Design a protein around this ligand. Structure first.
Ligand SMILES: CCCCCCCC/C=C\CCCCCCCC(=O)OC[C@H](COP(=O)(O)OCCN)OC(=O)CCCCCCC/C=C\CCCCCCCC
Ligand SMILES: CCCCCCCC/C=C\CCCCCCCC(=O)OC[C@H](COP(=O)(O)OCCN)OC(=O)CCCCCCC/C=C\CCCCCCCC
Ligand code: HEM
Ligand code: HEM
Ligand SMILES: CO/C=C(/C(=O)OC)c1ccccc1Oc1cc(Oc2ccccc2C#N)ncn1
Lengths: 380, 101, 80, 61, 109
């Protein structure tokens, strides 16, 4: 057929056109290392996930202890448990840096790659959410309870959708068993949609930090990026393991080392760090319905980014005003994250509403406005 | 007075693409109009643009910029594409308008 | 097939050396570090500000919260 | 010159390069473990069971 | 890809058949370089200037006949295998790319 079997074969050909002979911009930076880390992150969660699943029991009466049994009796069960739980954070850190990069470099102009990306994010959140319930600790149960009740606030079909989801009248055993099923399932959907993500991406190829056409200077993925990415893997993997081995519970809620108890509300029902920012926005709008929408919108807002691009240039590399607005936004998110971990009291309440309000202003109003303004300052 | 001019020249230096030796027009996102515009450029202008860009990407992968001497000066920045791009957009708007009537 | 259909390029020459003829991390002091500093300098006043501002807000809000937990003697000055 | 010898004997032929990695690993493991464990126990003198074990190990009742 | 492939074959898997034929082609070649007076004179001028003497076809043939598969492989390995080559490309060369990739075509048959 053809000279080398790396091009002719119906399968290698695929491996070649996406990991070896695939044309990559010669100037992509470290911010482009997060896609591969996300992929590796996913393979690792699925792997450690299956290993934990083989010892788990989805029943309110055995969940908590099945997880303890795993940590206490299974050979390296504790290690796997740690890696899986901490891997979830590594996953989100990587995803927020992946998203950031795209916002700062206008990657979102690759609409389908961007939209499939938002879907990956939503699926990843649902996965982590239902996974969090499995150990059936106090925050497991109360987080499930708080969040799922929000939806009984949807008009007319509210209580229905919720009671349907619960499989009863409250978060109970029939909820746990279906959440386990979902938690096992979604990651595979993530792997699938990821293939689509990269398929759309390959239609255009990668964007680069200067935002101008790199056809004049492309290099093969291998060895340049296979090496750059492997290096990027160990650089991140170090802080990861240092955390999972030297400070296993640094990010976890102590409340989860207590079996779920429907008759004892924890004093501070708050999520994992990666959900805090959204929890803050949730509580910013006093009114069950508005808060839920505000919550939903905090992430769905990402589907609008491609439509709010006004700049004549793709990236923010050469856009100083947009750059500061970008870091304001990032700082804005740290503040929301912080507010999300605090009780609902003064001064946190007002600060919360300010950061929630500026969050949407910056993405919906300022970014497109400053973009236009900058077009005028370039005499365009 | 010379306010708009003080601002522009300021943004121009604040932007910083001139440190890569790129002209303002070199930094345009290549949407549909820009692509057509580029096809109309005379060979020499086109090859120069290409080198400037290739050069920029190489500087970018190296994490360097040009020596202060080689930086494009605000007043010496040649708007080589703006003329074509305006005509392309003019033509497009005509058709859009006409196909409506 | 993505290599060979990318761009129409003319008159550009490039020179490159095998990796074995050169050093991996050359001129760390004469070129590398200077640039690292250059890069840091050029960005610090774009990134730092909003983060500093966030910090302040955080400090204020944390202290303002603990302060409201303390008692105001002016509520017991006539409780004889 | 070790580098040249190493190159000629080990790294030139892909077959020998693999053999060097395998044999290299087998030897690296043995050494690396003994060393790390050695360091860990020194940094933890008299705290590990290994250390106090003798007190109840055939020296009581 | 194919070219570098053939070089790798030289270092690792040359056949007595191949060399047997390569030798005959080479003999005919040396003989063909002495077809006329100018070419014979060119040879003399060079042989002296480079070897400091004349090497007769009778000698060349002697040397050429001593070459065998095993020998081709060793000599080639010694000059080609895992070496950093020098490359020059001119024209519409976008599809040829990366010194690194080429450098890797320099080892493992
Ligand atoms: C969302 C959930 C919230 C969770 C908390 C957010 C995480 C906060 C961590 C802080 C981020 C650390 C990164 C600091 C690095 C500083 C730095 O190098 O900035 C300068 C540098 C200069 O780039 P150029 O202009 O191209 O230079 C070329 C010419 N020489 O800028 C960059 O590297 C580009 C920025 C990309 C990284 C952004 C990461 C921030 C992450 C947060 C998510 C934000 C997006 C919204 C998500 C909504 C859900
Ligand atoms: C006790 C243990 C002993 C038993 C272990 C057996 C393992 C031995 C494996 C076989 C030996 C490998 C042979 C390699 C030969 C191929 C080759 O060319 O080298 C690799 C080649 C190098 O190219 P050149 O420098 O140009 O070499 C040219 C040679 N003249 O490619 C590489 O760079 C690969 C090596 C880098 C490895 C990077 C891996 C990073 C990963 C780190 C994270 C940790 C791992 C966790 C694993 C997860 C498992 C669930
Ligand atoms: C499980 C999650 C995801 C996986 C495995 C994944 C993987 C990848 C990979 C491997 C690439 C190529 C390498 C790179 O540029 O980093 C990529 C690119 C990209 N992804 Fe994702 N991604 C994920 C989520 C997302 C999300 C949430 C978004 C944004 C909402 C997104 C937006 C993009 C875009 C726009 C690109 C283009 C990058 C460029 O500008 O060149 N991805 N992703
Ligand atoms: C997208 C990948 C995944 C994410 C983000 C993820 C996330 C989580 C999270 C956040 C937890 C709770 C951690 C804790 O105990 O504090 C969890 C638990 C668990 N996950 Fe996953 N997981 C993923 C994939 C999988 C898969 C594919 C399986 C196996 C089919 C799996 C099985 C489990 C099991 C058994 C538990 C309960 C035991 C435990 O709490 O450690 N996970 N997961
Ligand atoms: C089952 O509760 C799981 C939690 C968790 O953090 O899992 C990782 C959790 C724990 C305590 C309190 C709330 C919890 O759940 C959540 C869930 C959540 O989900 C969203 C995130 C972004 C946008 C919309 C939603 C929703 N709904 N946003 C914030 N907290």
């Amino acid at each position: 057929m053809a000279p080398n079997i790396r091009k002719s074969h119906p399968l290698l050909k695929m491996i070649n056109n996406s990991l070896i002979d695939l044309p990559a911009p010669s100037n992509i930076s470290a911010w482009w290392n997060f896609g591969s880390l996300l992929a590796v992150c996913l393979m690792t969660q699925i792997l450690t996930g299956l290993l934990l699943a083989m010892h788990y029991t989805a029943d309110t009466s055995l969940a908590f202890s099945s997880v303890a049994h795993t940590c206490r009796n299974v050979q390296y069960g504790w290690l796997i448990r740690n890696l899986h739980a901490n891997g979830a954070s590594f996953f989100f850190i990587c995803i927020f840096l992946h998203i950031g990069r795209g916002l700062y470099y206008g990657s979102y102009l690759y609409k389908e790659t961007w939209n499939t990306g938002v879907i990956l994010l939503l699926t990843l959140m649902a996965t982590a959410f239902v996974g969090y319930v499995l150990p059936w600790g106090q925050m497991s149960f109360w987080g499930a309870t708080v969040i799922t009740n929000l939806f009984s606030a949807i008009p007319y079909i509210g209580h229905t959708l919720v009671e349907w989801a619960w499989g009863g009248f409250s978060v109970d055993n029939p909820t746990l068993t279906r959440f386990f099923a979902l938690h096992f399932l979604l990651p595979f959907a993530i792997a699938g949609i990821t293939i689509i993500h990269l398929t759309f991406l390959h239609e255009s190829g990668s964007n680069n930090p200067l935002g101008i056409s790199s056809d004049s200077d492309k290099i093969p993925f291998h060895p340049y990026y296979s090496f750059k990415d492997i290096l990027g893997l160990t650089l991140m993997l170090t802080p990861f393991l240092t955390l999972a081995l030297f400070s296993p519970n640094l990010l976890g809620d102590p409340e989860n080392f207590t079996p779920a108890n429907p008759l004892v509300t924890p004093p501070h029902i708050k999520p994992e760090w990666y959900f805090l920012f959204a929890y803050a926005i949730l509580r910013s709008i006093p009114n069950k319905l508005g808060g839920v929408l505000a919550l939903a919108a905090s992430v769905l807002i990402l589907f609008l980014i491609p439509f709010l691009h006004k700049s004549k240039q793709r990236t923010m590399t050469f856009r100083p005003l947009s750059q500061t607005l970008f870091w304001l936004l990032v700082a804005n998110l740290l503040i929301l994250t912080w507010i999300g971990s605090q009780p609902v009291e003064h001064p946190f309440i007002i600060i919360g509403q300010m950061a929630s309000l500026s969050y949407f202003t910056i993405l919906l109003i300022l970014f497109p406005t400053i973009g236009t303004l900058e077009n005028k300052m370039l005499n365009y | 007075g010379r306010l708009m001019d003080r601002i522009r020249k300021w943004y121009y230096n604040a932007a910083g693409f001139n440190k890569y030796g790129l002209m303002r027009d070199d930094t345009l996102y290549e949407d549909d109009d820009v692509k057509e515009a580029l096809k109309r450029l005379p060979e020499d202008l086109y090859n120069e643009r290409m080198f400037r860009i290739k050069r920029a990407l190489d500087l970018s992968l190296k994490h360097r910029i040009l020596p202060k001497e080689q930086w494009v000066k605000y007043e010496e920045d040649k708007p080589y594409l703006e003329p074509y791009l305006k005509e392309v957009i003019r033509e497009r708007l005509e058709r859009e308008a006409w196909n409506k009537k | 097939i993505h290599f060979g259909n990318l761009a129409r390029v003319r008159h550009i020459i490039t020179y490159s050396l095998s990796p074995f003829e050169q050093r991996a991390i050359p001129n760390i002091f004469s070129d590398a570090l200077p640039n690292v500093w250059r890069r840091f300098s050029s960005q610090v006043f774009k990134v730092a500000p909003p983060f500093l501002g966030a910090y302040l807000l955080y400090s204020w809000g944390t202290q303002e919260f603990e302060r409201l937990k303390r008692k105001n003697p002016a509520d017991y000055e006539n409780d004889q | 010159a070790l580098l040249r010898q190493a190159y000629s004997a080990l790294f030139r032929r892909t077959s020998t390069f693999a053999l060097t990695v395998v044999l290299g690993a087998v030897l690296f493991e043995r050494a690396f473990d003994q060393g790390a464990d050695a360091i860990f126990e020194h940094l933890n003198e008299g705290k590990l069971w290994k250390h106090i074990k003798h007190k109840y190990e055939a020296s009581e009742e | 890809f194919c070219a570098q492939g053939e070089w790798m074959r030289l270092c690792t898997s040359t056949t007595e058949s191949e060399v047997k034929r390569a030798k005959n082609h080479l003999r005919s070649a040396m003989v063909a370089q002495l077809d006329g007076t100018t070419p014979v004179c060119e040879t003399i001028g060079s042989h002296l200037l480079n070897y400091g003497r004349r090497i007769s076809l009778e000698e060349w043939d002697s040397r050429i006949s001593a070459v065998d598969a095993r020998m081709v492989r060793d000599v080639c390995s010694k000059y080609i295998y895992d070496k950093c080559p020098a490359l020059a490309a001119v024209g519409p060369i976008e599809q040829l790319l990366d010194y690194n990739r080429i450098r890797s075509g320099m080892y493992w048959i």
